[PDB]
Amino acid sequence: GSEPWKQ
Amino acid sequence: GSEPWKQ
Amino acid sequence: GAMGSMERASLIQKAKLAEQAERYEDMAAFMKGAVEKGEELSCEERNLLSVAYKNVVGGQRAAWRVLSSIEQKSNEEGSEEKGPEVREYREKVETELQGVCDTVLGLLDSHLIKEAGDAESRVFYLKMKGDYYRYLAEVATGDDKKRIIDSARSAYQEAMDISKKEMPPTNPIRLGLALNFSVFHYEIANSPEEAISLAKTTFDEAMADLHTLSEDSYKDSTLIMQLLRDNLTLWT
Amino acid sequence: GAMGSMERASLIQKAKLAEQAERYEDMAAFMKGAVEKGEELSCEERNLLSVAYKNVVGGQRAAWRVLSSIEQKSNEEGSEEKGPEVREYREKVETELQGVCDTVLGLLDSHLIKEAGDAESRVFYLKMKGDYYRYLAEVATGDDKKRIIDSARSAYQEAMDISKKEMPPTNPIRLGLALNFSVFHYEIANSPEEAISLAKTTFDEAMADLHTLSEDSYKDSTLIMQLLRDNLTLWT
Ligand SMILES: [Ca+2]
Ligand SMILES: [Ca+2]
Ligand SMILES: [Ca+2]
Ligand SMILES: [Ca+2]
Ligand SMILES: [Cl-]
Ligand SMILES: [Cl-]
Ligand SMILES: [Mg+2]
Ligand SMILES: [Mg+2]
């Protein structure tokens, strides 16, 4: 639900 | 390919 | 520091190897060593630092949630007493999680943020500061919970203010910041309406700017926009 | 030992929590502490010990294989020199893997195997000894490689001899032992024909004994039989 941990 | 690590 | 004898470039190279091997604790240690060389980080290096710590703390958070739930069930009505072990082990994982968050916040304070002058670096690091205070807030229950929440809110707000002045609405850093701040509003600050409004508005302003982008940038931006939409679907 | 002050029962309880949280390094440390209390392990406790270390070393093996491959490519014809970092980091992971294997082998030698008198416990621990020497053999390249391979072979052989005398052909421990010894033959000992013959024969003798089993035992045995069949399909 939050930003991806990797681009 | 080897035994499962958990039963 | 155990990385003090290793070249900066070697630490970066090994962080990339650790990522390939899914050795995120090693990756984080290598990137901490690189930060502690004292030079500013390039865009690629900032992202390696973030990947490493997001994965380390992310695994800790998942474990903490498993344990905290077991602990909650143990405190229900018909639950048999099993002793202090669930609380002890939840506290062990919690303390380790807090320690990693404190480590990241320490790198940001000494001295990544103060040397970051370009919008892309400064927003990135303030977003990091908001994220790791948010992770501290997820486990906080004591007299500093309010101050931890306000530290997260303040970092995210400063990042938002810069990002709105200095970046286009489709910039992936700006989008990820808005996404995480919206999650903060929903999950931490008891402000679901703020979370929904921020996500909606972020999505709509990005949509209106997609026409300016190359195919590759469009792919990057729309990926994060979809996450905003997924949350809106869950929240409404 | 850092677990010396914790009750045996609390270590077991926390190992089970760590398993639920997928915290396998913690789980292994708790089970090592439990072993070091000096009492024999029950069937359930032996399986917790094994789960923990299989997952720890299994992750190390996966990382080692990623790194060893990168290292192999770096030594191909047209490959650009990148310095010592890939070898160094592969060696770091290798040394950590060897250390965990040595820890398990040390618990087996002090004193799990010597007190294990029932077939189920003795076969289980000898199988463990074979497995962790097999993992050491996967990374061995020096003057002791042959002795490491023979240590694995000898442990597996003693376990096989006991299992054939004392257990039915469908016993899941016996089946898993035969499966892992067949993998040893194929992957370590350069003996694919032996691996195939062992798997085939194990499968056929188990098939002939399934009629004696309850529904639940039939499910347990047939799961491992399918792994033997999967390897036979890959190997032939
Ligand atoms: Ca790791
Ligand atoms: Ca600067
Ligand atoms: Ca672990
Ligand atoms: Ca005994
Ligand atoms: Cl604990
Ligand atoms: Cl290294
Ligand atoms: Mg700009
Ligand atoms: Mg018997």
Three-state SS string across chain D, please?
A: CCCCCCCHHHHHHHHHHHHHCCCHHHHHHHHHHHHCCCCCCCHHHHHHHHHHHHHHHHHHHHHHHHHHHHHHHHCCCCCCCCCCHHHHHHHHHHHHHHHHHHHHHHHHHHHHHHHCCCHHHHHHHHHHHHHHHHHHHHHCCCCCHHHHHHHHHHHHHHHHHHHHHHCCCCCHHHHHHHHHHHHHHHHCCCCHHHHHHHHHHHHHHHHCCHHHCCHHHHHHHHHHHHHHHHHHHHHC
Q: Which sign, positive or negative, has the C-alpha torsion D100, D105, D110, D115?
A: positive
Pick from D195, D185, D179, D114: nearest CA to D149: D185
Contact list, A1 vs chain C (CB under 8 Å) = 183, 227, 230-231, 234
Does residue D137 contact residue D110 with C-beta atoms inside 8 Å?
no
Give the integer Cα–Cα distance in Å for C78 and C140: 27
Interface check for D43 against chain B (CB to CB < 8 A): the answer is no
Tokens representing residue C166 in the block = 């200095």
CA distance linking residue D94 with residue D228, whole number of Å: 29
Residue of D204, D198, D196, D200 lying closest to D177 (CA atoms): D198
Verify cis geometry, omega within 30 degrees of 0, for the bond prior to D185. no
D232 touches chain B (CB under 8 A): no
Of B1, B5, B6, Cβ closest to residue D231? B1
Instruction: List chain C residues with CB under 8 Å of D82.
Output: 13
**Closest to C92 measured CA to CA, from D208, D34, D26:** D26
Of D47, D51, D179, the CB nearest to B2: D179
- Name, in order, each residue with C-beta under 8 angstroms of D58's C-beta and a sequence gap of 6 or more: B5
Identity of residue C133 = Y
**Which two tokens mark D141?**
């390249």
Query: H helices of chain C, where?
Result: 8-20, 24-35, 43-74, 85-107, 113-115, 119-139, 145-166, 172-187, 192-207, 215-235
Q: Residues of C105-127 as b/e, b for ≥16 C-beta within 10 angstroms?
A: bebbeeebbeebeebbbbbbbbb
PDB resolution in Å: 1.1
**How many Å lie between the alpha carbon of D126 and the closest alpha carbon of chain C?**
30
CA-CA distance, C188 to C154, in Å (whole number)?
13
Dihedral of alpha carbons D201, D203, D209, D211, sign: negative
Chain-chain contact of D93 with C10 (C-beta, under 8 angstroms)? no
Chain C CA closest to residue D63: C21
Residue of D nearest to B6 (CA): D51
- How far is the C-alpha of C131 from the C-alpha of C149, rounded, in Å? 11
Please name the residue that has the structure tokens 């992202």. Answer: C47
Which one-letter DSSP state was computed for residue C169? T
For residue D1, give both structure tokens: 């030992």
Buried b / exposed e across D151-190, counting CB within 10 Å, b at 16+? Answer: bbbebbebbbebbeeebebbbbbbbbbbbbbbbbbbbbbe
Nearest CA among C205, C156, C204, C212 for reference residue C184:
C156
C chain contacts of residue D16, beta-carbon cutoff 8 Å: none
Quote the DSSP letter at residue C36: T
Among D129, D107, D100, D102, smallest CA distance to D39 is for D107
State how far the Cα of C176 lies from the Cα of C170, in Å rounded to an integer: 10
Residue that the structure tokens 């069930």 belong to: C73
Given an 8 Å threshold on Cβ–Cβ distance, is B5 in contact with D58? yes
Chains B/A: 3 or more C-beta pairs closer than 8 A? Answer: no
How many other C-beta atoms can be found within 10 angstroms of the C-beta atom of residue C44?
Answer: 11
Q: Is C21 helix (H, G, I), strand (E, B) or coil?
A: coil
Experimental determination technique: X-ray
CB contact at 8 A, D103 and D75: no
Residue D227 and residue B1: Cβ atoms within 8 Å? yes
C touches D, CB cut-off 8 Å, minimum 3 pairs: yes
- Per DSSP, the three-state class of C95 is helix
The C-alpha atoms of residue D142 and residue D177 are separated, in whole angstroms, by 27
What is the C-alpha to C-alpha distance for residues D147 and D153, in angstroms, rounded to an integer?
A: 10
Report helix angle D85-107 to D119-139, nearest 10.
160
Is any Cβ of chain A less than 8 angstroms from the Cβ of C58?
A: yes
Give me the half-sphere count of Cα atoms (radius 13 Å) on the Cβ side of residue D40: 13
- The answer to whether D182 and D202 are in contact (CB under 8 A) is yes
Neighbours of D119 (CB within 10 A): 17
- The answer to whether B7 contacts D224, with C-beta atoms less than 8 Å apart, is no
| Cα dihedral across residues D79, D84, D89, D94: positive or negative | positive
Q: Measure the CA–CA gap between A3 and C55, rounded to whole angstroms.
A: 12
Looking up tokens 């609390």, which residue turns up? D10
